Symmetry: D2
Subunit: 235 residues, 4 copies
Amino acid sequence: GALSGKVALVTGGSRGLGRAMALRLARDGAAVAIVYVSDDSSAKETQGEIERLGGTARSYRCDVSDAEQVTRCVKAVTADLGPVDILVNNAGIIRDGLAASIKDEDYDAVMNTNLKGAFLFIKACYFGFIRKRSGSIINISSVSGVFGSAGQANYASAKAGLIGLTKSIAKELAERNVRCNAVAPGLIATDRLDPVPMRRFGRPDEVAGLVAFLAGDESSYITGQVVCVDGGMAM
Amino acid sequence: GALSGKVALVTGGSRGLGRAMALRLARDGAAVAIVYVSDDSSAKETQGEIERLGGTARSYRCDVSDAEQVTRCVKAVTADLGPVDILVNNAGIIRDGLAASIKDEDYDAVMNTNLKGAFLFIKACYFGFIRKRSGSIINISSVSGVFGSAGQANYASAKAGLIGLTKSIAKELAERNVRCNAVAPGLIATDRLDPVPMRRFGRPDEVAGLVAFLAGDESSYITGQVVCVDGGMAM
Amino acid sequence: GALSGKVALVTGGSRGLGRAMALRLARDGAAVAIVYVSDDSSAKETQGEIERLGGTARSYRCDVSDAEQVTRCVKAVTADLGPVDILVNNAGIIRDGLAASIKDEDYDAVMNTNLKGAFLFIKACYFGFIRKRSGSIINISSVSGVFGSAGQANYASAKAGLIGLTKSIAKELAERNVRCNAVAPGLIATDRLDPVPMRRFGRPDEVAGLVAFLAGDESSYITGQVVCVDGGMAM
Amino acid sequence: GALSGKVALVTGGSRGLGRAMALRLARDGAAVAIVYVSDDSSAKETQGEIERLGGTARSYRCDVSDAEQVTRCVKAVTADLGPVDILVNNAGIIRDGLAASIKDEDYDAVMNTNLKGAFLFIKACYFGFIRKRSGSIINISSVSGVFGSAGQANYASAKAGLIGLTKSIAKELAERNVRCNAVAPGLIATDRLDPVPMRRFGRPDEVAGLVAFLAGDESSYITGQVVCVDGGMAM
């Protein structure tokens, strides 16, 4: 009871980090829309989880890369739970490999799911955010999006591009009191620690904590920021 | 009741931002030690405030620049409320002017109150933090410490130096599960908005929110970070 | 006579910044390949310029977005002038507008010309660079790619993504002594200054200077960096 | 013959990195003033070196920490070689140790030699720079000043503070066409490589290259920047 029945849309909330985010957001009192590729099993399992502990949630199988199968999905969300106050872009495909083994298949998959998706969902929710004078957009940006990483040029470019998006949107909506920030997780279980000063993996609910903080009113004057959750990895 | 009766030490908690921090930390259920230069009136007024709404607090007039009048103050705190889990370095003097009008008086005042103080308090609390395997150190770093500012070379250098301290400590204590992070407030009332995208000043309790988040268990995997609260100013 | 007859490939060297880069690189004694969309007039005018003052140069009309019409172009370059030592990615389309007026046409044009192109050219030159133990890749990254910009979410995302690419490649090739860096120009004539501390536009040959430095042996231990040429704009 | 007989002042140019800088600056055709603690032997050896290969140079034993024994030194320089166009702050003491073993002796030595010195020399040269409408100030900022380092909290704070100084001065002098930038060297021989992607130490003349570039007219639109020379270490 800290989100006050607001509506959160978590793309790629199917599983893992997104699942922790959806669970957390719901437990703070927000109706969560779970958008996914996706296996429907994990998604309705996530919703069943949110409901089991008394939270409001819905699921939406959507292609985040389609220019607006997204819009269909978004005003479906708006119809079902109401206008979006919180948008979490977590949809993303990983396809590693040296920049010379990288392929258009890999490249465009990664780029469309990790970067384009955010563009299209932000496009969909943009006039609502503005007409409301409130809003918190949270993009998932990888620590490899902050300082790069070998053999992940395609994923890392997508995540860095996501950070650029975050900044530009934040500047774009700042005067209409709509915030946009980025989250840069490091090494996270679940499914090496040398450059990680804390010498341990992170848990998803630790990332979920940061998403929840960025989504609430405690971060009302924070916008355009890139916050790592990496155990100090990319400090 | 979210700090669980832990102990927070807020240097420069006399007034303004520090006061909002002390108030906030206390309201989340932490015994707060208010360390100040300082006018005692505002400090015991802050404590009287914390107490009035049922919080635990003490005041300590200390010179943050003395090499260890600080230590006296710190184990006074430890004697009175207990070992420190949360350390907030907010002590700081501002003395503006073009780098050629800057004076040793100004320079050393700013540098000792804004930078040295943090060094000495971190020195004091350092073995406690380590022996406990827990800890959250929050340094106040100005947005002018992030991208500089004209006519504030002396203050800005102090704040940037504070960010360097933050990083080095975070690396230094990471394996013993002690976090260290920096907060970079922008334009904050109370006592021009063109480079501020949100086109408004910030309120102190908005900065206090970020300090509280960085102090709790929601930021347990965050360390070595520099988070602005500037309305997007230094994004 | 400071490039020693090495071979530089400048995509988008048709005109403007790219033209200044090609001219400069040539004047330091490098055979320059001018790759462009492009109007052929400006390109062969650029080559005619390089030749007029005694430099070696060739032109290549290529689609930087085609997955490898690029490769055809690149081993054309290799056939004509020799293996590439210096790669400058300057190809880029600008299509501004609020993130809700942004269109797939705009979006994919910007993203493919500004980001994908770099991927494909780096792909093409990658084994040459490695087999040689030398190499300097210079990506053009905008200052709007560093801190974002309103109404340029699509361009800014592309440029930030370019910075992520730069980092990942630098890490990827570092051990084989191949450098990769990014250049972030600010406001540049030729064809407002408030956030620009120097209170003036930049000239293209000033950016060209930085490209030339990053291309030579004076920057042999510099890699993975993002250097602004913005009059302090994004400091 | 690329500095055109301008005057460069290199504090801590006694030895090592500073020596490479003084040598390099001189070879590009600049009269170099070698300011040092210092052993006079190495300094006049450096000058003897510059002279041996036909360069103009002078030496000045000065306490960079004295508030203005510095000024005496600076208008000595001005008397001997002429007004300063280039200022390189390289004076610095290193005294490592965990933040709890750090001592006022250590702390103030490091802070005064690494940070205060820059303040005082910039103070001395500031009206000359302004009256001339030209100028390049180069501060040496360590890579540990960029992302911190364990057991070097005191040195790292000094170097980060140096970066803050750089920014503030750059903003402060930008309109009078005086540039200020920072150099962040990584692991440099002469007198472990895991976080260094290039898997090798750097040579001093590689850092000297960057200083020379930042000192000339090739970087005329670059100001307020922090450029690493670390083999990608702090990318």
